[PDB]
Amino acid sequence: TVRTLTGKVVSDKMDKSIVVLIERRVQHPLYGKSIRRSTKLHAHDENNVAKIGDVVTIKESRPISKTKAWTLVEVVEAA
Amino acid sequence: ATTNQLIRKGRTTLVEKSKVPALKACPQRRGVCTRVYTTTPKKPNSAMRKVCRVRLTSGFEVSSYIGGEGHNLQEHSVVLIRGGRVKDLPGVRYHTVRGSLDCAGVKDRNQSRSKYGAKRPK
Amino acid sequence: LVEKLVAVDRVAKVVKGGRIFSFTALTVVGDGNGRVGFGRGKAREVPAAISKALEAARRNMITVDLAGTTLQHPVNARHGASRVYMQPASEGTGVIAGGAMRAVLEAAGVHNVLAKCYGSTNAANVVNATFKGLRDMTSPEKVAAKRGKSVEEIQ
Amino acid sequence: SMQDTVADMLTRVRNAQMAKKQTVSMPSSKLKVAIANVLQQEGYISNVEVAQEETKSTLTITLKYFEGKPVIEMVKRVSRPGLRQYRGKDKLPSVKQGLGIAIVSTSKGIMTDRAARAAGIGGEVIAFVS
Amino acid sequence: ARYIGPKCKLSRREGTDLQLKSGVKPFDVKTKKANKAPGQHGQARGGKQSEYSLQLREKQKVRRIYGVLERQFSNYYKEAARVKGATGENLLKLLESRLDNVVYRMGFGSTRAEARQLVSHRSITLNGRRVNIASIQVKAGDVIAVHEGAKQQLRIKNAIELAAQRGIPAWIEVDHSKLEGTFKAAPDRSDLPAEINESLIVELYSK
Amino acid sequence: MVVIRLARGGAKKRPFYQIVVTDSRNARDGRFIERIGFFNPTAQGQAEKLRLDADRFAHWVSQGAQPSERVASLAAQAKKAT
RNA sequence: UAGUUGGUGGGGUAAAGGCCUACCAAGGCGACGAUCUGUAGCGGGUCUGAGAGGAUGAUCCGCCACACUGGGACUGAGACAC
RNA sequence: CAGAAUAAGCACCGGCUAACUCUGUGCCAGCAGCCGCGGUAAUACAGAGGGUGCGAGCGUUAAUCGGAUUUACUGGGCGUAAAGCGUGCGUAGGCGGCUUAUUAAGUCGGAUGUGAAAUCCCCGAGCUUAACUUGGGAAUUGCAUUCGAUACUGGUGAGCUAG
């Protein structure tokens, strides 16, 4: 009942914060070829469990800081 | 082109320029007659054709043909100009409206009167 | 037998001390029920050229299988730099085509069709392309015969 | 290098038909065999055979000629590696107003556009044959 | 606006009788200049025409009998193309459904101009109401009667006796004693004269 | 507050009202919440004169919507008729 | 890009929040176009076109912004108020 | 109640494009959207007669799309017409051999919610008809959530040898 996204971590320097890269595949509106797009989302990770390279799940939540509105749920795969 | 080439760079369209820049997308313009005179046609035509250099409210100075036989225009007259080229006269891209502001309608004309601006004879 | 004259043009040949003028004529003949042909003729005078073109058209003829008064399926054809597209239409549409295609289609007996030219609009080349397309159009019975099936199987 | 084996197979069939051969052979794959089976079922070709030496597999197809012309007059690849084409159940293409067949790969296997519309599913459009 | 002026040159240009006169005298005795165009450069009927000339000349003939102008005729075509059926058949049905034409064919007017004048001067009633628009479309099962003040008109009695010479059509039944008539349905193409070609109009307006 | 009132449409001298539930601060012929019927003061022939959805009317009144005088009279007349 | 990106204590708001403040750390964005620069109110819709598209945003409806030009706050349920 | 009594113009007639002759002038006066007319017989200039097309309107100018497959996704080209970098290597990217197990991201299907009203289209209703107004539908080709399918593409594990 809560919006979730699955991605891979690309940064862990910040305290209690991780940057995860989301990727999606869509068709070009005119030429019809399938294109891949990427989005970088800041998430909240209280215990710094995540690291660069793991596959994580995040869920939508209320704002925590200026740029963070998502929170970590679980780590699917480890690096 | 390939699909990848089209995605990276799409098709490009070239803009079109108007043939009557001095009108500035208006049906007619008003001007003050700066120089009335006559010119000679390009080959293979020979005549003496009446034109006038006019300064418009658009900030441009152009040349305009005078249609019909017999006109009363002179220096500093106020005239209305429309679009239309004269073809055999190079550089004349506009026409003067007959009988609008200071120009008068042609005389002794009974056909095509709405052009040249002649009223119905009594 | 309905006959149409598509175009007449005047041509010239240069000799010493002047030019020789001649006339060419392109004509299309048909029966209105699936037999149509076209031809060209050259002469010194227009009526003679028309007569020769009509004779050539009568000699060069083919048979076209129609679906009632319209085409079996969409057709794309070409000859040289002229390309033609033809599409079947429902009743009451009429013949929506250019003059060169209109002559051939009406002579062959098509009543409802939509057609379009691309590329060059030379009359002889357009007539050639339309003629080729009408010649090469196929039919469900022929398809079933070639595939070893039944008409209802083919659908 | 070679990057479209299905297109290669269709090109081989087209060239063999234009040169008037009796049989055509190629390296085999399950997708190619599945397409050849649909062609044989629809009646454009006669026989499909697969041979295995040790690990190489050879696929052989027997061609059909009726009157003077070949049975397959047109075969076009629609989906290609540089542009994949997917269609819904209501936008499946029709070939020659139903006189030809469009080969469609759906979640229930490879079939024609007619069978795909009958089953109410869509998929990938491989080729047009007529 | 309605056309006013000479009718015999109008008919002479098209080459066929347009029924613009009462008919007490035949057309040939009426004009004596048939198969001659009105102009001084007028020639015989055999003059060659282009297809564009033929389509235009047919549409003008169709317009001239009914007295309809270009705007209304184009609207009629655009409505007939929308309605399902044969476009020419629909157009003929629309043209024959106008109130003035029904009044003329019912025999209360010697000519369509007379019928138009009678309708416009409020001398006709439709379903019990006095109307004054010539282009009102008449529907199936209608009743057209002559108004009380309109009755006892010598022009009307002459019109009915003249109509007696022709044949009252199938879709219209008239009690001439009561000056009353009943439109039942739109004529099919067979009832109308077959010399009219509508295909030319069709491609002329579908260009 | 929330009101049930008439919004005008139609042609000059021939008004035709929609019955709408809306916030009172909105313009007469503008934003509204829900349309629940119509009123035609000059209906003739086969044309209906007043359609009103009684259940929606009651539901909105139960939540504190205030009908105008004309709408209340129309609702009473419709209830009388049916 | 240096309140800049994140964290802790405190302040502040009807309310989450660098919204503000004192420290701690060096992060944050960018060839999937950051920064700079030109132009522009947005949509339902309208015109054209076989369609795909192209042009457009008067009159009607929804949202936004402005009120001689800039900076503020008061009263009030609600304004930074033609 | 009165009495036809109060009420028709504009463009055009060489071709493209329906509609032709005579007078006046002689590369002059002039016309002209393109091709082009006029330098003593002008169907092309001006007038007149005649005619054609529209009609309370008729013509001109300006602007947008179309015709234009003339930016080509549908739907174009590169030997000589415009167009293959002077030739390699290589980064990002695009694409990629065969078999098998699994996943369900792409892809396909169902259900639910939403996609305001007006506008477009259909069947009706009220205006003497029509414009116009209006009832009910259809449509809004989209988005989101959730449940399913596994042929193809992608991910992961294993295996093979024609590259």
CA atom of B108 to C1′ atom of H139, Å: 63
Interface test with A, best of D83, D85, D125 (most A CBs within 10 A): D83
Whether the CB-CB separation of D116 and D104 falls below 8 Å is answered with yes
Hunting for tokens 């004879």 — which residue is that?
Answer: B121
CATH label of the domain that carries residue E52: 1.10.1050.10
Burial class of residue D69, CB neighbours in 10 A (0-12, 13-18, 19+):
exposed
- Residue A79 to residue B10: CA distance in whole angstroms: 40
- Residue A4 to residue A72: CA distance in whole angstroms: 10
- The range of the structural domain enclosing residue E151 comes to 96-183
Asked if residue E91 and residue E123 are part of one domain, the reply reads no
E109 in a structural domain: yes
Q: Is B55 helix (H, G, I), strand (E, B) or coil?
A: strand
Asked if residue E100 and residue E32 are part of one domain, the reply reads no
Breaks (C-N over 2.5 A) in chain D follow: none
User: With respect to CATH, is domain C63-147 assigned 3.90.1570.10?
Assistant: no
Helix (H), strand (E), coil (C) string for chain C? CEEEEEEEEEEEEEECCEEEEEEEEEEEEECCCCEEEEEEEEECCHHHHHHHHHHHHHHCCEECCCECCECCCCEEEEECCEEEEEEECCCCCCEECCHHHHHHHHHHCCCCEEEEEEECCCHHHHHHHHHHHHHHCCCHHHHHHHHCCCHHHHC
CATH label of the domain that carries residue E144: 3.10.290.10
Binding partners of D (≥3 Cβ pairs within 8 A): A, B, C
E146 in a structural domain: yes
Q: Is D24 helix (H, G, I), strand (E, B) or coil?
A: strand
Burial class of residue C15, CB neighbours in 10 A (0-12, 13-18, 19+):
exposed
Neighbours of E200 (CB within 10 A): 18
Hunting for tokens 């198969």 — which residue is that?
Answer: E35
Asked if residue E35 and residue E86 are part of one domain, the reply reads yes
- Residue E14 to residue A73: CA distance in whole angstroms: 89
Residue C37's nearest CA partner among C79, C2, C86, C75 is C2
Neighbours of C25 (CB within 10 A): 24
Counting the structural domains of chain A, the total is 1
Asked if residue E201 and residue E155 are part of one domain, the reply reads no
Structural domain spans, chain C: 2-62, 63-147
Tokens of E19: 């029924």
How far, in Å, are B36, B41, B50, B88, B89 from residue B46 at the CA level?
19, 6, 13, 10, 11
Hunting for tokens 């219209």 — which residue is that?
Answer: E172
> Distance from C117 to chain D by nearest Cα, in Å?
20
E1 in a structural domain: no
**Residue C92 to residue E87, Cβ atoms within 8 A:** yes
Residue A41's nearest CA partner among A53, A25, A57, A27 is A57
CA atom of D10 to C1′ atom of H84, Å: 29
CATH ID of C2-62, from 3.40.50.150, 3.30.565.10, 3.30.160.20, 3.90.190.20? 3.30.160.20
Asked if residue A63 has a cis previous peptide bond (ω within 30° of 0), the answer is no
Amino acid identity of D32? K
Whether the CB-CB separation of F37 and F51 falls below 8 Å is answered with yes
At residue E58, φ and ψ (nearest 5 deg) are -70, -45
Residue E35's nearest CA partner among E46, E25, E24 is E46
How far, in Å, are E105, E130, E177 from residue E181 at the CA level?
10, 15, 11
Tokens of F3: 């009101």
- The range of the structural domain enclosing residue A73 comes to 1-79
CA atoms within 13 A on the CB side of C109: 16
- Residue C117 to residue C85: CA distance in whole angstroms: 7
- Residue D116 to residue C79: CA distance in whole angstroms: 37
Binding partners of C (≥3 Cβ pairs within 8 A): D, E
Q: For the sheet containing E124-126, what is the strand order? A: E129-130, E124-126, E142-146, E180-183, E172-175
Asked if residue E79 and residue E108 are part of one domain, the reply reads no
Give me the resolution in angstroms, 1 decimal.
2.3
Contact flag for C and E (3+ C-beta pairs < 8 Å): yes
Nucleotides on chain H within 7 angstroms of protein Cβ: 8-12, 17-21, 27-39, 46-56, 58-64, 69, 71-73, 76-77, 93-100, 105-110, 116-117, 122, 125-130, 132-135, 145, 148-153, 160-163
